[PDB]
């Protein structure tokens, strides 16, 4: 056993490794989305910048979980990072919708992890999830929802003008 | 009853007084360790500085619990502060090992206190412990573990050179 | 066809997608190595910092290739990022040796890509590889070689003192 | 022979004179486009500014080739600068499309020049073209492509509103 390990269930250790993979997957999804908007036939530079930033934020989320694993005396086990479900993201609206779905999926995983930490009476792990993950998820979901709403109301995806103006005035 | 008291169980009040004593005990252990390294026949000034700082930090932990007791309308009851288990701490490695054991013991007490606060549905007390104690404990335990590891790998306690170089490059 | 595409062979486009995957793989290898050194039973913080920096640099290498793909009118196609070959990296010396092997493998791929670009008379792609990749690879390989040499001469991996002192004086 | 001349083929010298003319022609095309947008019945001041800047950049491209000719000991021979193919550029979208076509034509000429320099084993000339011309061309082509895409998606050229808003938010 690790000399630092205390009140850290093997199930929690495994669940943290699963979450590390999911955060890295989210980073990869946003990386793919970003460069879609950098295509010469899409050409929305602020969509590209927004998603690239989100990609880097997800890598930080993964790194903090790796730090947590070691802090508690668990051992990191990495798996393949799956490619994103799409190569072509269709439109600014469709990418925002996919990002919303992604964030809600990652949120569900975090809630299941918190439930496990509660079941195993691990208040340090509960606090870690609450402090560093749960409100960040709620804010990200709300922001993406707001963006989807704007784009729909402006007439996307059929209006290329709508996506252009949203790119300039909200993401720029 | 105190005019401020609300949702604060007598058992929680007693457990807080027990924790105050334990934090003061930890302060005393680190004070003893510090001056061991200030001995002319030990002479590791950065070990001495490190443990003196830890001693002062533990006094702050005790003071914050005393503040909490009064905030919630409980009444502070103090007990003797027991002398540390050792007069002679043997080596830098042995002191670090004793500090690791101490921090894990104090952590166990904090986890039992959190379990009591949960059992009595006292979310303010739960949050207090999580916010101000539990991650500080996890960080301290990880740091001490890292230090023990370094010292062992460098050849302590038999290598006086190892302890000297660790004193200079990690604690200095 | 893309409106921007000119003198860009389909084979080159495919080879660039292969290189993007390899750079992301290299980023993942260094991420794994970094947190190995953050383990409480390894505890070499400057090895950890060094490899984390290298991980972030590899992500920038991948991003620049994604930018290139779009600049030339090719289309990005992403694949799974394979997990690193090892979970446990053994020692500072062994990790440096694995990093050296990794960088030489990535270099070989870049040289094959340059040979393809030469075969297809694509001087823009040749210049891109030379300017942004080939000397960076040569410098990284030389640095890792120097590090391996130091560690061996100092007595690693058997000397935990050697790895500690290298961590402090070269990587710190 | 020039006292400085070394490894500089007569064919390369002639090809450089041809490129000088083409760069001056490109400068003239952009000058014409610029003042089209300054017409009172067109009135898009940021299109005008953008193309005037591009015109001045092309003159710098020509000047650098003239400097190169003398550096290598060749002799500059100038020809008439042909007037642009159009007097009336129709719309912001049409001008951007013509600029894209122009840049791809100039790129093709640069690639033919690089092929000649390769055939004559003139690595200095190869490096000159790669360093100062080929990536500038790729970037210009990508930028113009992005602009064409935006304008089409926004509803140009039929939407005078689209061209107005693009003028303000992308070129302004
Ligand atoms: Cl335990
Ligand atoms: Cl445990
Ligand atoms: Cl367990
Ligand atoms: Cl696992
Ligand atoms: Cl997984
Ligand atoms: Cl896997
Ligand atoms: Cl699978
Ligand atoms: Cl359970
Ligand atoms: Cl709990
Ligand atoms: Cl949060
Ligand atoms: Cl919000
Ligand atoms: Cl908030
Ligand atoms: Cl919004
Ligand atoms: Cl009450
Ligand atoms: Cl009460
Ligand atoms: Cl009570
Ligand atoms: Cl009491
Ligand atoms: Cl007591
Ligand atoms: Cl007493
Ligand atoms: Cl007693
Ligand atoms: Cl109870
Ligand atoms: Cl509660
Ligand atoms: Cl804390
Ligand atoms: Cl820590
Ligand atoms: Cl932390
Ligand atoms: Cl340490
Ligand atoms: Cl072509
Ligand atoms: Cl082509
Ligand atoms: Cl082809
Ligand atoms: Cl491909
Ligand atoms: Cl691949
Ligand atoms: Cl795949
Ligand atoms: Cl496979
Ligand atoms: Cl070929
Ligand atoms: Cl070539
Ligand atoms: Cl380079
Ligand atoms: Cl070097
Ligand atoms: Cl160099
Ligand atoms: Cl070195
Ligand atoms: Cl010659
Ligand atoms: Cl000559
Ligand atoms: Cl000749
Ligand atoms: Cl001529
Ligand atoms: Cl001519
Ligand atoms: Cl003429
Ligand atoms: Cl003529
Ligand atoms: Cl020839
Ligand atoms: Cl050559
Ligand atoms: Cl260039
Ligand atoms: Cl570009
Ligand atoms: Cl570039
Ligand atoms: Cl654009
Ligand atoms: Cl507007
Ligand atoms: Fe974000
Ligand atoms: Fe951010
Ligand atoms: Fe995340
Ligand atoms: Fe997220
Ligand atoms: Fe401390
Ligand atoms: Fe402190
Ligand atoms: Fe404490
Ligand atoms: Fe403590
Ligand atoms: Fe590097
Ligand atoms: Fe760097
Ligand atoms: Fe790389
Ligand atoms: Fe590399
Ligand atoms: Fe330009
Ligand atoms: Fe310029
Ligand atoms: Fe030019
Ligand atoms: Fe040009
Ligand atoms: Mg998963
Ligand atoms: Mg698959
Ligand atoms: Mg709670
Ligand atoms: Mg909290
Ligand atoms: Mg918070
Ligand atoms: Mg007690
Ligand atoms: Mg006694
Ligand atoms: Mg906290
Ligand atoms: Mg591959
Ligand atoms: Mg596998
Ligand atoms: Mg260079
Ligand atoms: Mg000509
Ligand atoms: Mg004529
Ligand atoms: Mg260059």
Swiss-Prot record, chains A, B, C, D:
Fe cation 2 binds at residues 58, 103, 137. It catalyses: 4 Fe(2+) + O2 + 4 H(+) = 4 Fe(3+) + 2 H2O. It comes from Homo sapiens (Human). Oligomer of 24 subunits. There are two types of subunits: L (light) chain and H (heavy) chain. The major chain can be light or heavy, depending on the species and tissue type. In the human liver, the heavy chain is predominant. The functional molecule forms a roughly spherical shell with a diameter of 12 nm and contains a central cavity into which the insoluble mineral iron core is deposited. Interacts with NCOA4; NCOA4 promotes targeting of the iron-binding ferritin complex to autolysosomes following starvation or iron depletion. Keywords: Acetylation, Cytoplasm, Cytoplasmic vesicle, Iron, Iron storage, Lysosome, Metal-binding, Neurodegeneration, Oxidoreductase, Phosphoprotein. Belongs to the ferritin family. One of its GO terms (cellular component) is tertiary granule lumen. Fe cation 1 binds at residues 23, 58, 61. The record marks 18 as: Essential for association with cargo receptor NCOA4. GO terms for molecular function: ferric iron binding; ferrous iron binding; ferroxidase activity; identical protein binding; iron ion binding; iron ion sequestering activity. Residues 6-155 form the Ferritin-like diiron domain. It holds the Pfam family Ferritin. One of its GO terms (biological process) is negative regulation of ferroptosis. Expressed in the liver. Its EC number is 1.16.3.1. This is Ferritin heavy chain. The keyword DNA damage does not apply. Stores iron in a soluble, non-toxic, readily available form. Important for iron homeostasis. Has ferroxidase activity. Iron is taken up in the ferrous form and deposited as ferric hydroxides after oxidation. Also plays a role in delivery of iron to cells. Mediates iron uptake in capsule cells of the developing kidney. Delivery to lysosomes is mediated by the cargo receptor NCOA4 for autophagic degradation and release of iron. It is linked to Hemochromatosis 5: A disorder of iron metabolism characterized by iron overload. Excess iron is deposited in a variety of organs leading to their failure, and resulting in serious illnesses including cirrhosis, hepatomas, diabetes, cardiomyopathy, arthritis, and hypogonadotropic hypogonadism. Severe effects of the disease usually do not appear until after decades of progressive iron loading. The gene is FTH1. InterPro entries: Ferritin, Ferritin-like, Ferritin-like_diiron, Ferritin-like_SF, Ferritin_CS, Ferritin_DPS_dom. It is found in: Cytoplasm; Lysosome; Cytoplasmic vesicle, Autophagosome.
